[PDB]
Amino acid sequence: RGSHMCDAFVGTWKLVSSENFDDYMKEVGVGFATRKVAGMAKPNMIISVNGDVITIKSESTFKNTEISFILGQEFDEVTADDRKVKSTITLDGGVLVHVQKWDGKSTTIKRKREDDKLVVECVMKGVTSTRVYERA
Ligand SMILES: COc1ccc(S(=O)(=O)Nc2cc(C(=O)O)ccc2F)c2ccccc12
């Protein structure tokens, strides 16, 4: 197989900034103790592409997680904060758009490349958070 545009995401990334994530987590419904421990974490994110399958791994002192998915195809995800969600990830103009659905709720996480960074923007009921990763 040849190159794909989404190979721009591939690599090893480290969190360098996080803005408003506590208020986002409150809107998502994350409990106090999990918010405090999860907000401290400075994860590494490892993204790989193999054929049609994209794999996103996160490693941190809080939790290790791994999702593998095909664009546009719904999957089951257990999130780092222990929600059991239905997830669908698509590519819209270079941006990975990830919708998580659970318990009648929904949140959207966008991942995009900007300069040498990977920018993660999430939104829940009007509350947004921005988390920025750099190459590790
Ligand atoms: C480290 O505590 C977490 C790790 C991951 C998730 S999430 O469900 O994967 N969504 C997500 C991930 C990122 C990221 O990886 O930076 C940025 C914004 C997000 F909404 C969490 C979701 C809720 C609370 C804590 C989470």
UniProtKB/Swiss-Prot annotation:
Q: Which UniProt keywords apply?
A: Acetylation, Cytoplasm, Lipid-binding, Nucleus, Phosphoprotein, Transport
Subcellular location per the Swiss-Prot or TrEMBL entry: Cytoplasm; Nucleus
- Sites of the modification Phosphotyrosine? Y24
List the Pfam families. Answer: Lipocalin
Q: Per UniProt, what is one GO molecular function of this protein?
A: fatty acid binding
Q: What Gene Ontology cellular-component terms does the record carry?
A: cytoplasm; cytosol; extracellular exosome; lipid droplet; nucleus
Annotated motif Nuclear localization signal, positions: 26-36
- Lipoprotein among the record's keywords? no
Q: Which residues carry this modification: Phosphoserine?
A: S17
- Residue numbers bearing the N-acetylcysteine modification: C6
| Binding locations of a fatty acid | R131, V132, Y133
Q: Which domain of life is it from?
A: Eukaryota
Q: Which family does it belong to?
A: Belongs to the calycin superfamily. Fatty-acid binding protein (FABP) family.
Question: Its biological function?
Answer: Lipid transport protein in adipocytes. Binds both long chain fatty acids and retinoic acid. Delivers long-chain fatty acids and retinoic acid to their cognate receptors in the nucleus.
Quaternary structure? Monomer. Homodimer. Interacts with PPARG.
Notes concerning its domains = Forms a beta-barrel structure that accommodates hydrophobic ligands in its interior.
Q: What is this protein called?
A: Fatty acid-binding protein, adipocyte
Organism, scientific name: Homo sapiens
